[PDB]
Design an enzyme around this catalytic site. Structure first.
Site, PDB file in Angstrom:
ATOM      1  N   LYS A 186      -9.792   9.208  56.139  1.00  0.00           N
ATOM      2  CA  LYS A 186     -10.647   8.018  56.193  1.00  0.00           C
ATOM      3  C   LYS A 186     -10.489   7.209  54.903  1.00  0.00           C
ATOM      4  O   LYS A 186     -10.476   7.783  53.784  1.00  0.00           O
ATOM      5  CB  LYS A 186     -12.122   8.391  56.378  1.00  0.00           C
ATOM      6  N   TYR A 219     -14.375  13.022  50.070  1.00  0.00           N
ATOM      7  CA  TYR A 219     -14.839  14.425  49.983  1.00  0.00           C
ATOM      8  C   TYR A 219     -14.272  15.147  48.772  1.00  0.00           C
ATOM      9  O   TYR A 219     -14.738  16.242  48.409  1.00  0.00           O
ATOM     10  CB  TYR A 219     -14.470  15.228  51.242  1.00  0.00           C
ATOM     11  N   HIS A 237     -13.908   4.394  57.012  1.00  0.00           N
ATOM     12  CA  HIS A 237     -14.997   5.397  56.898  1.00  0.00           C
ATOM     13  C   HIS A 237     -16.362   4.795  57.170  1.00  0.00           C
ATOM     14  O   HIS A 237     -17.166   5.446  57.865  1.00  0.00           O
ATOM     15  CB  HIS A 237     -14.934   6.058  55.523  1.00  0.00           C
ATOM     16  N   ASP A 287     -10.554  17.382  60.001  1.00  0.00           N
ATOM     17  CA  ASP A 287     -11.150  16.114  59.622  1.00  0.00           C
ATOM     18  C   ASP A 287     -11.356  16.086  58.105  1.00  0.00           C
ATOM     19  O   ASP A 287     -12.045  16.971  57.576  1.00  0.00           O
ATOM     20  CB  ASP A 287     -12.500  15.946  60.340  1.00  0.00           C
ATOM     21  N   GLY A 308      -1.530   6.678  73.200  1.00  0.00           N
ATOM     22  CA  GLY A 308      -0.630   7.549  73.889  1.00  0.00           C
ATOM     23  C   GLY A 308      -0.528   8.951  73.365  1.00  0.00           C
ATOM     24  O   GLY A 308       0.210   9.760  73.961  1.00  0.00           O
ATOM     25  N   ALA A 309      -1.215   9.273  72.268  1.00  0.00           N
ATOM     26  CA  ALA A 309      -1.226  10.589  71.665  1.00  0.00           C
ATOM     27  C   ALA A 309      -2.406  11.415  72.157  1.00  0.00           C
ATOM     28  O   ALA A 309      -3.418  10.904  72.605  1.00  0.00           O
ATOM     29  CB  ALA A 309      -1.220  10.503  70.137  1.00  0.00           C
TER      30      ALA A 309
HETATM   31  N1  LIG Z   1     -17.530   9.910  59.299  1.00  0.00           N
HETATM   32  C1  LIG Z   1     -18.554  10.205  58.515  1.00  0.00           C
HETATM   33  O1  LIG Z   1     -19.193   9.360  57.906  1.00  0.00           O
HETATM   34  C2  LIG Z   1     -18.940  11.654  58.498  1.00  0.00           C
HETATM   35  C3  LIG Z   1     -20.235  12.016  58.069  1.00  0.00           C
HETATM   36  C4  LIG Z   1     -20.701  13.319  58.122  1.00  0.00           C
HETATM   37  C5  LIG Z   1     -19.858  14.269  58.596  1.00  0.00           C
HETATM   38  N2  LIG Z   1     -18.527  13.966  58.930  1.00  0.00           N
HETATM   39  C6  LIG Z   1     -17.557  14.997  59.338  1.00  0.00           C
HETATM   40  O2  LIG Z   1     -18.182  15.868  60.246  1.00  0.00           O
HETATM   41  C7  LIG Z   1     -18.107  17.217  59.742  1.00  0.00           C
HETATM   42  C8  LIG Z   1     -19.231  18.093  60.248  1.00  0.00           C
HETATM   43  O3  LIG Z   1     -20.517  17.547  59.832  1.00  0.00           O
HETATM   44  P1  LIG Z   1     -21.350  18.168  58.613  1.00  0.00           P
HETATM   45  O4  LIG Z   1     -20.490  18.803  57.615  1.00  0.00           O
HETATM   46  O5  LIG Z   1     -22.285  17.101  58.183  1.00  0.00           O
HETATM   47  O6  LIG Z   1     -22.266  19.280  59.298  1.00  0.00           O
HETATM   48  P2  LIG Z   1     -22.262  20.308  60.530  1.00  0.00           P
HETATM   49  O7  LIG Z   1     -20.887  20.569  60.921  1.00  0.00           O
HETATM   50  O8  LIG Z   1     -23.265  19.782  61.505  1.00  0.00           O
HETATM   51  O9  LIG Z   1     -22.983  21.560  59.828  1.00  0.00           O
HETATM   52  C9  LIG Z   1     -22.311  22.234  58.735  1.00  0.00           C
HETATM   53  C10 LIG Z   1     -23.249  23.330  58.278  1.00  0.00           C
HETATM   54  O10 LIG Z   1     -23.466  24.283  59.354  1.00  0.00           O
HETATM   55  C11 LIG Z   1     -23.122  25.582  58.893  1.00  0.00           C
HETATM   56  N3  LIG Z   1     -22.592  26.318  60.032  1.00  0.00           N
HETATM   57  C12 LIG Z   1     -21.354  26.134  60.567  1.00  0.00           C
HETATM   58  N4  LIG Z   1     -21.146  26.920  61.614  1.00  0.00           N
HETATM   59  C13 LIG Z   1     -22.253  27.642  61.728  1.00  0.00           C
HETATM   60  C14 LIG Z   1     -22.613  28.626  62.672  1.00  0.00           C
HETATM   61  N5  LIG Z   1     -21.765  29.113  63.593  1.00  0.00           N
HETATM   62  N6  LIG Z   1     -23.829  29.223  62.498  1.00  0.00           N
HETATM   63  C15 LIG Z   1     -24.684  28.781  61.536  1.00  0.00           C
HETATM   64  N7  LIG Z   1     -24.404  27.781  60.675  1.00  0.00           N
HETATM   65  C16 LIG Z   1     -23.185  27.202  60.804  1.00  0.00           C
HETATM   66  C17 LIG Z   1     -22.157  25.387  57.736  1.00  0.00           C
HETATM   67  O11 LIG Z   1     -22.269  26.542  56.870  1.00  0.00           O
HETATM   68  P3  LIG Z   1     -21.016  27.219  56.135  1.00  0.00           P
HETATM   69  O12 LIG Z   1     -20.016  26.190  55.848  1.00  0.00           O
HETATM   70  O13 LIG Z   1     -21.645  27.864  54.893  1.00  0.00           O
HETATM   71  O14 LIG Z   1     -20.553  28.261  57.075  1.00  0.00           O
HETATM   72  C18 LIG Z   1     -22.717  24.126  57.088  1.00  0.00           C
HETATM   73  O15 LIG Z   1     -23.864  24.433  56.267  1.00  0.00           O
HETATM   74  C19 LIG Z   1     -17.998  17.013  58.260  1.00  0.00           C
HETATM   75  O16 LIG Z   1     -17.718  18.181  57.520  1.00  0.00           O
HETATM   76  C20 LIG Z   1     -17.061  15.851  58.137  1.00  0.00           C
HETATM   77  O17 LIG Z   1     -15.757  16.382  58.350  1.00  0.00           O
HETATM   78  C21 LIG Z   1     -18.043  12.651  58.907  1.00  0.00           C
END
Ligand SMILES: NC(=O)c1ccc[n+]([C@@H]2O[C@H](COP(=O)([O-])OP(=O)(O)OC[C@H]3O[C@@H](n4cnc5c(N)ncnc54)[C@H](OP(=O)(O)O)[C@@H]3O)[C@@H](O)[C@H]2O)c1
Ligand SMILES: NC(=O)[C@@H]1C[C@@]2(NC(=O)NC2=O)c2cc(F)ccc2O1
EC number: 1.1.1.21
Length: 316
Positions: free
Chosen positions: A78, A49, A111, A44, A10-11
């Site tokens: 998570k 982390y 997670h 997130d 519901g959120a």
């Molecule tokens: N549930 C899970 O198991 C799980 C696993 C992986 C990820 N996640 C979540 O998903 C989030 C996002 O995934 P991710 O951190 O793996 O990678 P992502 O969001 O796909 O990519 C992050 C990278 O892209 C760069 N970037 C961001 N915006 C940009 C843009 N406009 N132009 C060029 N480069 C850009 C960032 O650089 P800068 O930061 O230097 O700007 C960083 O190096 C995570 O941070 C986490 O919160 C969850």
């Protein structure tokens, strides 16, 4: 494009959130402050982390400054794999809450489906280097997650990195009290997840797309892996729309009715990534981006491939 999606509790959940994996603790407070200033209403997080205290410093400053009200924020964390035991779940949640300096979470996720031996190490290893599992199964961990709802610590519970049969296991759990609200999974043009997404959506579970930019900062990146942000075909779609390649990669999951959580600690990119409410990809563009799938994963949890609940043996 409405900014929020309705969950089965519901959120309403903001469809764009800020990711924080790999966000250095010395930079993530400013990143979250900036993100809230420029419109983000979903963050997130995760205990594994190791930066939740610093995320929480930012949330608390913006609540105190009355930039935002608590009800307008959607904060996600998570449960790490070493806390799957029923006896440990509440404490794990409360540590996250204390670090984020919150009295509730909007969403708390398991997670991974894999439980690990509890202890100080996040990846406990035997002397041969295999992750040591725990014997607690996901259904009992889910019952523990349900208790957090009934204690007021979390408004919604969900899952992450669950494959379709594991989602099915929870949905068929005897005595199930709350369905998962969300399954958060990797998703982008090289790992389009069409089968798992349709399964979840048909069950009323909202999907959040992680690594939407292909996680260029992942610590195991190799020169020879595909690069979404440099792919000429995606750059061409961005050019046609007068947007950046990242903006196209963020808008793409939005138009699949997904939530998306790009990470940045760069103030200009935090702002650019939010500016995805001013344009529309055509259906031709969506089909074309879907055609780039190659089943390429950023996060394959390679240390855990023999765990009984390893999610990525199954086709989806
Ligand atoms: N549930 C899970 O198991 C799980 C696993 C992986 C990820 N996640 C979540 O998903 C989030 C996002 O995934 P991710 O951190 O793996 O990678 P992502 O969001 O796909 O990519 C992050 C990278 O892209 C760069 N970037 C961001 N915006 C940009 C843009 N406009 N132009 C060029 N480069 C850009 C960032 O650089 P800068 O930061 O230097 O700007 C960083 O190096 C995570 O941070 C986490 O919160 C969850
Ligand atoms: N798997 C992980 O979550 C960390 C991430 C990271 N730790 C971190 O703070 N940023 C990172 O990319 C990291 C950095 C490394 F050099 C090597 C492994 C590694 O693993």
């Amino acid at each position: 494009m409405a900014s929020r999606i309705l969950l089965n509790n519901g959120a309403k959940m903001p469809i764009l959130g800020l990711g924080t994996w790999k966000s250095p603790p010395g930079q993530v407070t400013e990143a979250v402050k900036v993100a809230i200033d420029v419109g983000y209403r979903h963050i997130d997080c995760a205990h594994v982390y190791q930066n939740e205290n610093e995320v929480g410093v930012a949330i608390q400053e913006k609540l105190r400054e009355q930039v935002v009200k608590r009800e307008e924020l959607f904060i996600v964390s998570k449960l790490w794999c070493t806390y799957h035991e029923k006896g440990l779940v509440k404490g794990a949640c409360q540590k996250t809450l204390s670090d984020l300096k919150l009295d509730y979470l909007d969403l708390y996720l398991i997670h991974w489906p894999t439980g690990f031996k509890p202890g100080k190490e996040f990846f406990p290893l035997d002397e041969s280097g295999n992750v040591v599992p725990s014997d607690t199964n996901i259904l009992d961990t889910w019952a523990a997650m349900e208790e957090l709802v009934d204690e007021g610590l979390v408004k919604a519970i969900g899952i992450s990195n669950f494959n379709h049969l594991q989602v099915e296991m929870i949905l068929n759990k005897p005595g199930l009290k709350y369905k998962p609200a969300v399954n958060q999974i990797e998703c982008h043009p090289y790992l389009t997840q069409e089968k798992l997404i349709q399964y979840c959506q048909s069950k009323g579970i909202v999907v959040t797309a992680y690594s939407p930019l292909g996680s260029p900062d992942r610590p195991w990146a190799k020169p020879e892996d595909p690069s979404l942000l440099e792919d000429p075909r995606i750059k061409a779609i961005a050019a046609k729309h007068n947007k950046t390649t990242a903006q196209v990669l963020i808008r793409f999951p939005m138009q699949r009715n997904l939530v998306v959580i790009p990470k940045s600690v760069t103030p200009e990119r935090i702002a650019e990534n939010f500016k995805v409410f001013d344009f529309e990809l055509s259906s031709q563009d969506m089909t074309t981006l879907l055609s780039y799938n190659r089943n390429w994963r950023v996060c394959a949890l390679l240390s855990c491939t023999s765990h009984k609940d390893y999610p990525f043996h199954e086709e989806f």
